[PDB]
């Protein structure tokens, strides 16, 4: 009785057009009722009821039902969800034909003109061929929420929707290779459509809401490195506000920037410390933030060494005078060798200003044995300021507040430039990202302009070990995923000269996995007791060898990376030749590829791109894919999210067979397994992994971690080789 | 906060 339209005309309620579409979505699903749904929402109806209204009762009644014992209300809530964004971006589930869309949307302005120039209709004809609309009936409800807030074309005033998830894949393939020979074109478009749509791989969120729109801005992370000057400091403030004003992740390393009381000029001006400059990229780093607040994240690295070490590293501690505090960025420590040695013998640690010290700093990242030489020297010459400190205590501080605010940041530089594909004496990885996963070459700006500095982006996609189902089809799924990178690399806008530079001299990529969790369960294996090792052994040498060998038959294509030469690749130097050697004894699988070949073409037609993979967290692309995020354990079998729209569940992939099978991240009596497999993954890895150290008080004597474990854990990653560690979860329930 | 230097010093790194 009385139901509103979209005009706003009146009609009666028939209700068995309701149950026809629960009926449709129900389709194939297990432990639904669409009774129960019917039952729920029915109550919520009235005369007059916008269609619009009962529509979305329905996807709630049903999305209200999700659960570990019921999950696939996911994807009867998705389906409801799927039909009205149908009718909402189309008038009628049928999408329409992909050059008409196309056309409107041109016309519009919601999508790039060049599509049009660069397709002809036959071709996007030929194009919609390839798209299979039903692949939207196989999104999770959180996936669909996923879409429709930050994927989808979409006015974001007046509310309306564009288009549908099939038109996206389609069209982030008909970007990505749109410079393609009319020979190959469409064979890569259908085939990484087909990739992309049946969530074999995953693309991060700037290059799925962005790409095929009008915008050009798809980088999601910087690094910028600052030289120890006012002018380095002023354009690397400058860089940052360009970079956070397209909302991405910042990662600065001010490890040069000379201590308090240092001389200036002479002894005309005693310099005034780190932190008010600290302070100033953290607004840098805020400048397009709702008041101060409000996104804008960034990661500042500095040595452990550094004069000022003991008042950076309680920046965060909330106790404190505001003029000693920068509290709205995370750190990363960076240790080496000598450092954990003076730990483990119970020494100390001299700290110095990089100012005073010629030579110290790089060979800090770039030559451990000079390193140490220089080290020692200085530590002796007393015409050197410094200071000295017990390696237990400083240590113990860093770990404290590590504890504490989880955001402090470990990075193992000797590991970073000892085991990585670049020259260290040529370009060698001083810092990391916001999230610890980038390791990239970087040079300071003496000017935000300035065509002789360098940095580094996180060109990133990803693999979903649940959705293949041999480690061979990597071979076809790191060819699509390489070349489209790539060619994004050419296809999008570089804000900052050294940001480009960087980019087109090396081309480097970073490719890691999501589901891996899921994977495990799948095999039967868990993450703490080492049963696991062998089989991620295996996993990650084939991930590394097939983008190897893309980027490999790409330089053939079309030529290596301008600067291909400062890479140890370059020089016939592979993965499986530095790693870490204590791995050896953590895992016996043997390498299944042809490694050898492939160094020699390698050397022969060098790479395309310097860098391939990178262990980065994800939790907006696992969510479309119902994928376990990255390479984490999940916290429980169903995870909720908050929303304008209600209570978002999401299942754990398969938990009516795998429930048992998966190892839930408070499970794990330790961080040892994890800690084990990560060095294995790092063993083929080109860049650094996001690894997290997890601790349960429940688990200790009064409830309260010993920082004698902290140090244990934190040396058992320097063992296998862990490059850089991520946050620290406290378990507080 | 308790830390033995000992327990750590035959660590191999
Ligand atoms: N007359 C109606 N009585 C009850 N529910 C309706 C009615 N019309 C539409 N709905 C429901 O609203 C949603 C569709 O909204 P919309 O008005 O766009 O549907 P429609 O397909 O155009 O409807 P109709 O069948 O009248 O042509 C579905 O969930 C459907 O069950």
Same mark, same amino acid.
């Given at each position: 009785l009385l139901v509103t339209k979209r005009d706003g005309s009146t009609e009666r309620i028939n209700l068995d057009k309701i149950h026809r579409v629960l009926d449709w979505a129900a389709e $194939? /699903? %297990?432990? &639904? +009722?669409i009774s129960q749904v019917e039952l729920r929402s029915h109550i919520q109806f009235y005369d007059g009821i916008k269609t619009s209204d009962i529509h979305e009762t329905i996807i709630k009644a049903a999305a209200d039902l999700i659960s570990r014992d019921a999950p696939d209300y996911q994807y009867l809530a998705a389906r409801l969800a799927i039909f009205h964004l149908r009718k909402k971006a189309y008038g009628q589930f049928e999408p329409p034909a992909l050059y008409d869309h196309v056309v409107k949307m041109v016309e519009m302005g919601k999508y790039d003109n060049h599509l049009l120039e660069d397709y002809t209709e036959e071709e996007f004809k030929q194009m919609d061929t390839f798209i299979d609309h039903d692949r939207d009936m196989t999104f999770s409800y959180a996936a669909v929420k996923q879409l429709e807030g930050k994927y989808l074309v979409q006015?974001? &005033? *007046? $509310? !309306?929707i564009y288009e549908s998830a099939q038109f996206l894949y389609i069209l982030v393939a008909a970007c990505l290779f749109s410079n393609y020979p009319r020979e190959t074109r469409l064979q890569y478009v259908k085939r990484f459509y087909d990739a992309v749509s049946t969530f074999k791989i995953s693309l991060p969120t700037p290059i799925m809401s962005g790409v095929r729109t009008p915008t050009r801005q798809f980088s999601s992370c910087v690094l910028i490195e600052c030289g120890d000057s006012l002018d380095s400091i002023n354009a690397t403030s400058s860089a940052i506000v360009k970079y956070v004003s397209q909302r991405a992740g910042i990662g600065i390393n001010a490890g040069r920037i000379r201590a308090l009381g240092s001389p200036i000029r002479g002894g005309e001006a005693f310099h005034t410390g780190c932190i008010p400059f600290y302070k100033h990229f953290q607004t840098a780093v805020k400048s397009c933030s709702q008041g101060g607040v409000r996104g804008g994240a960034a990661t500042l690295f500095y040595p452990?060494? %550094?004069? !000022?070490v003991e008042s950076l590293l309680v920046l965060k501690n909330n106790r404190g005078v505001e003029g000693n505090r920068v509290r709205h960025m995370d750190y990363g420590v960076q240790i080496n060798k000598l450092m954990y040695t003076r730990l483990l013998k119970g020494e100390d640690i001299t700290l110095f200003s990089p100012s005073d010290v010629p030579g110290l700093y790089d060979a800090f990242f770039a030559d451990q044995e000079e390193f140490e030489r220089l080290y020692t020297k200085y530590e002796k010459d007393d015409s050197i300021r410094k200071q000295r400190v017990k390696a237990v205590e400083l240590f113990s501080l860093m770990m404290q507040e590590r504890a504490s605010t989880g955001r402090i940041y470990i990075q193992n530089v000797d590991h970073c430039n000892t085991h +990585?594909?670049?020259?260290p004496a040529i370009a060698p990885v001083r810092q990391s990202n916001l999230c610890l996963e980038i390791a990239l070459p970087t040079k300071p700006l003496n000017d935000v302009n300035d065509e002789n500095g360098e940095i580094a982006l996180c060109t990133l996609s990803a693999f979903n070990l649940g959705a293949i189902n041999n480690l061979d089809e990597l071979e076809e799924l790191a060819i699509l995923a390489v070349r489209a990178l790539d060619a994004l690399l050419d296809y999008q806008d570089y804000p900052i000269p050294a940001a480009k530079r960087g980019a087109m001299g090396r081309r480097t990529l970073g490719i890691g996995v999501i589901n891996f969790a899921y994977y495990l369960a799948k095999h039967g294996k868990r993450y703490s007791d080492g049963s696991a090792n062998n089989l991620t052994h295996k996993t990650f040498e084939a991930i590394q060898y097939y983008l190897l060998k893309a980027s490999n038959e790409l330089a053939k294509e079309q030529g290596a990376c301008p600067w291909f030469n400062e890479t140890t690749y370059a020089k016939g130097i592979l993965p499986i030749d530095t790693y870490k050697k204590d791995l050896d004894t953590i895992a016996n699988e043997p390498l299944h590829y042809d490694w050898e070949a492939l160094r020699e073409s390698i050397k022969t %037609? $060098? /790479?395309?791109?310097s860098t391939l993979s990178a262990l980065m967290p994800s939790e907006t692309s696992s969510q479309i894919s119902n994928a *376990?995020? $990255?390479?984490e354990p999940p916290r429980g079998y169903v995870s909720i999210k908050a929303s304008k729209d209600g209570i978002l569940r999401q299942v754990v992939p398969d938990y009516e067979h795998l429930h048992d099978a998966y190892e839930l991240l408070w499970e794990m009596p330790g961080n040892d397994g994890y800690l084990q497999l990560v060095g294995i993954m790092q063993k083929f890895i080109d860049q650094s992994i996001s690894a997290n150290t997890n601790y349960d008080p429940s688990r200790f004597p009064s409830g309260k971690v010993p920082m004698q474990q902290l140090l244990k854990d934190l040396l058992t990653a320097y063992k296998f080789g862990v490059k850089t560690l991520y946050y620290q979860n406290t378990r507080d329930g | 906060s308790e830390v033995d230097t000992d327990d750590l010093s035959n660590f191999q790194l």
């Open positions: $194939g /699903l %297990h432990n &639904v +009722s006015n974001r &005033v *007046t $509310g !309306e452990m060494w %550094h004069l !000022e +990585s594909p670049f020259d %037609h $060098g /790479l395309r791109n *376990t995020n $990255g390479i | -």
